[PDB]
UniProtKB/Swiss-Prot annotation, chain B:
Residues 41-49 are cytoplasmic. Class II viral fusion protein. Fusion activity is inactive as long as E1 is bound to E2 in mature virion. After virus attachment to cell receptor LDLRAD3 and endocytosis, acidification of the endosome induce dissociation of E1/E2 heterodimer and concomitant trimerization of the E1 subunits. This E1 trimer is fusion active, and promotes release of viral nucleocapsid in cytoplasm after endosome and viral membrane fusion. Efficient fusion requires the presence of cholesterol and sphingolipid in the target membrane. N-glycosylated. It is a single-pass type I membrane protein. It is found in: Virion membrane; Host cell membrane. It comes from the Viruses. The chain crosses the membrane at residues 20-40. Interacts with spike glycoprotein E2. The precursor of protein E3/E2 and E1 form a heterodimer shortly after synthesis. Processing of the precursor of protein E3/E2 into E2 and E3 results in a heterodimer of the spike glycoproteins E2 and E1. Spike at virion surface are constituted of three E2-E1 heterodimers. After target cell attachment and endocytosis, E1 change conformation to form homotrimers. Interacts with 6K protein. Interacts (via fusion peptide loop) with host LDLRAD3 (via domain LDL-receptor class A 1); this interaction mediates viral entry to the host cell. This is Spike glycoprotein E1.
From Swiss-Prot, chain C:
This is Capsid protein. Forms an icosahedral capsid with a T=4 symmetry composed of 240 copies of the capsid protein surrounded by a lipid membrane through which penetrate 80 spikes composed of trimers of E1-E2 heterodimers. The capsid protein binds to the viral RNA genome at a site adjacent to a ribosome binding site for viral genome translation following genome release. Possesses a protease activity that results in its autocatalytic cleavage from the nascent structural protein. The chain holds residues 114 to 275 of 1254 of the full protein. It comes from the Viruses. It is found in: Virion; Host cytoplasm; Host cell membrane; Host nucleus. The modification Phosphoserine is found at S11. The very N-terminus plays a role in the particle assembly process. The N-terminus also contains a nuclear localization signal and a supraphysiological nuclear export signal (supraNES), which is an unusually strong NES that mediates host CRM1 binding in the absence of RanGTP and thus can bind CRM1, not only in the nucleus, but also in the cytoplasm. The C-terminus functions as a protease during translation to cleave itself from the translating structural polyprotein. Homodimer. Homomultimer. Interacts with host karyopherin KPNA4; this interaction allows the nuclear import of the viral capsid protein. Interacts with spike glycoprotein E2. Interacts with host IRAK1; the interaction leads to inhibition of IRAK1-dependent signaling. Part of a tetrameric complex composed of host CRM1, host importin alpha/beta dimer and the viral capsid; this complex blocks the receptor-mediated transport through the nuclear pore. Interacts with host phosphatase PPP1CA; this interaction dephosphorylates the capsid protein, which increases its ability to bind to the viral genome.
Length: 52, 49, 162
């Protein structure tokens, strides 16, 4: 149970990191005033194929 | 008797199970560092202006 | 000149953030996307835009949403050309220097959030979210975007939500 609990915490931490990672990507994406960030996505490729 | 605490066996298998724990901790440590690194990249990109 | 700038502001469609009949801020559409100050409480003065689901941005304490193409037909025009000098906004003129906007004291206050800053071409260079009294003048907390398309928020130390 101890080992499982530790792994569980690691999974939760990883998820938290992922969410913060998505924020880090979206940060520069704000909009941005332009609606055009092809090249930001092309380089970072954080995911969520955006869009058409 | 005997009756000692090694604890007890079984090498191979002992290591197999031991190795299963801590790996996920290392992963989230690496991810943590990488997240900070990316953050600094963003901060630099902002300071660029 | 300020008159002509106001005329462009009048042509530009802007919508205050209404709460209990009180304007707590402003929200508008630039580059075909809606932006709204999150720290401001209330709803935009536009049911059509209100019908749109927004996304949160804790980093900047802002929300945003995608605008229907038909509504994108006429939105605000942004530029990355941000030379030092003077710009124009709703509350008169503003000095741009060191990448920061400053105006005479007594200008700007809580509820002014969302007011953009325009150049001589009527192009957006920054958006005012807050500010802080700086002696004979006040320093504005703003967001602006460089030629790299990077969102940069300039916030004075201990800046007040204006």
């Amino acid at each position: 149970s101890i080992c499982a609990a530790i792994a569980t915490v690691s999974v939760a931490a990883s998820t938290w990191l992922f969410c913060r990672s998505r924020v880090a990507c979206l940060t520069p994406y704000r909009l941005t005033p332009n609606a055009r960030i092809p090249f930001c996505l092309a380089v970072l490729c954080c995911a969520r194929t955006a869009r058409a | 008797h005997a009756q000692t605490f090694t604890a007890a066996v079984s090498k191979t298998a002992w290591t197999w199970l031991t190795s299963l724990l801590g790996g996920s901790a290392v992963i989230i440590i690496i991810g943590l560092v990488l997240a900070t690194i990316v953050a600094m990249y963003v901060l630099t990109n902002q300071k660029h202006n | 000149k300020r008159q002509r700038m106001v005329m462009k502001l009048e042509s530009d469609k802007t919508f205050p953030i209404m709460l209990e009949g009180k304007i707590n801020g402003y929200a508008c559409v630039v580059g075909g996307k809606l932006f709204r100050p999150m720290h401001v409480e209330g709803k935009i003065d536009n049911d059509v835009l209100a019908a749109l689901k927004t996304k949160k941005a804790s980093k900047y304490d802002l929300e945003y949403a995608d605008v229907p193409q038909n509504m994108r037909a006429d939105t605000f025009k942004y530029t990355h050309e941000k030379p030092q000098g003077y710009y124009s906004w709703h509350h008169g003129a503003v000095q741009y220097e060191n990448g920061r906007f400053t105006v005479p004291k007594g200008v700007g206050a809580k509820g002014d959030s969302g007011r953009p800053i325009l150049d001589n071409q009527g192009r957006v260079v920054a958006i005012v979210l807050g500010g802080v009294n700086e002696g004979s003048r006040t320093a504005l907390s703003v967001v602006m975007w460089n030629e790299k398309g990077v969102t940069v928020k300039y916030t004075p130390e201990n800046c007040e939500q204006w």
